[PDB]
Amino acid sequence: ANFENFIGATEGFSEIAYQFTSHILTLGYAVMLAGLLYFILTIKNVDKKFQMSNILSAVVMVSAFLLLYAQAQNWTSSFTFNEEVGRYFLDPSGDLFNNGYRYLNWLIDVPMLLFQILFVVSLTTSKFSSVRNQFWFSGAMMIITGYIGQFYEVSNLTAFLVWGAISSAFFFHILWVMKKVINEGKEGISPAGQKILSNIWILFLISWTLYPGAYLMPYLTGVDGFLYSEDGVMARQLVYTIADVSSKVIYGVLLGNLAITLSKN
Numbered sequence: 162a163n164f165e166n167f168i169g170a171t172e173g174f175s176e177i178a179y180q181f182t183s184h185i186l187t188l189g190y191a192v193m194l195a196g197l198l199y200f201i202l203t204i205k206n207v208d209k210k211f212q213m214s215n216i217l218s219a220v221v222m223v224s225a226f227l228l229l230y231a232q233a234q235n236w237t238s239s240f241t242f243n244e245e246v247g248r249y250f251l252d253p254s255g256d257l258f259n260n261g262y263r264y265l266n267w268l269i270d271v272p273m274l275l276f277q278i279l280f281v282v283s284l285t286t287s288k289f290s291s292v293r294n295q296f297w298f299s300g301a302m303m304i305i306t307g308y309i310g311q312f313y314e315v316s317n318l319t320a321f322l323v324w325g326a327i328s329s330a331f332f333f334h335i336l337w338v339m340k341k342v343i344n345e346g347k348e349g350i351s352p353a354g355q356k357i358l359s360n361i362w363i364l365f366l367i368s369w370t371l372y373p374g375a376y377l378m379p380y381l382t383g384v385d386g387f388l389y390s391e392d393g394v395m396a397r398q399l400v401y402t403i404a405d406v407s408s409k410v411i412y413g414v415l416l417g418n419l420a421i422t423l424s425k426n
């Protein structure tokens with residue numbers, strides 16, 4: 162199926178690769194639940210006109226609590242321990258570890274994380290509906306092609322790469338539209354909130370770039386590399402989780418901070 166299974170069918174997992182990964186995937190959904198409550202309880206702090214931003218952060222949290230919990234469980238129950246070999250192996254009776262919970266969680270989240278900036282910041286010469294439609298089309302295709310190429314990670318790898326770049330194309334378009342949005346958004350706000358908008362843009366830049374980094378993480382050292390192992394698996398799943406907290410939780414926090422800062426009139 163995927164590289165995670167491959168490693169759990171051929172070489173198996175050491176007990177520390179398996180516990181680490183399970184522990185990191187549990188942290189991912191725990192944060193989402195703490196985030197959900199933070200966004201709900203803080204909506205009283207921001208003027209009515211920016212509250213749609215909190216509402217959207219809260220629904221992204223419900224989406225990511227549930228599906229990152231599904232994902233966590235699909236990792237634990239897909240592997241059983243072999244006491245004779247001392248490593249964890251793909252359980253033929255279990256479900257087989259799957260990526261479809263994460264990619265679905267991206268597909269749902271992506272219109273919402275992009276739409277929500279447009280409820281805090283104002284455009285100048287760009288058209289709102291123009292920006293919205295560009296966000297929703299390319300963020301869907303970025304993820305849908307990302308999911309397709311994900312099927313060919315273990316099998317045909319040039320399909321894994323031709324697709325991963327197709328999805329890069331949509332990715333870079335979003336970065337372009339986000340960049341115009343943040344610029345027009347800086348016009349006619351205080352220097353304080355401009356600073357936050359600049360933060361939001363650096364965060365939006367790093368946190369989203371981690372995602373294709375974790376896509377290639379095992380092949381990043383070549384087809385016979387130090388990461389071609391239960392190591393680039395650990396690191397792939399450590400990087401997704403970092404990119405999940407940053408792009409969903411931290412991002413929504415800086416937006417709520419920006420909103421509050423724009424209620425200094």
Ligand SMILES: *C\C=C(C)/C=C/C=C(C)/C=C/C1=C(C)CCCC1(C)C
Pocket residue numbers: 266267270271274303304307308325326328329332369372373376405408409
């Ligand atoms: C959790 C919410 C969001 C919006 C997640 C976004 C993820 C990405 C931007 C991932 C992009 C990919 C790229 C650029 C190429 C390989 C396939 C990925 C889906 C990992």
Ligand code: NA
Pocket residue numbers: 225229263266267405
């Ligand atoms: Na996720």
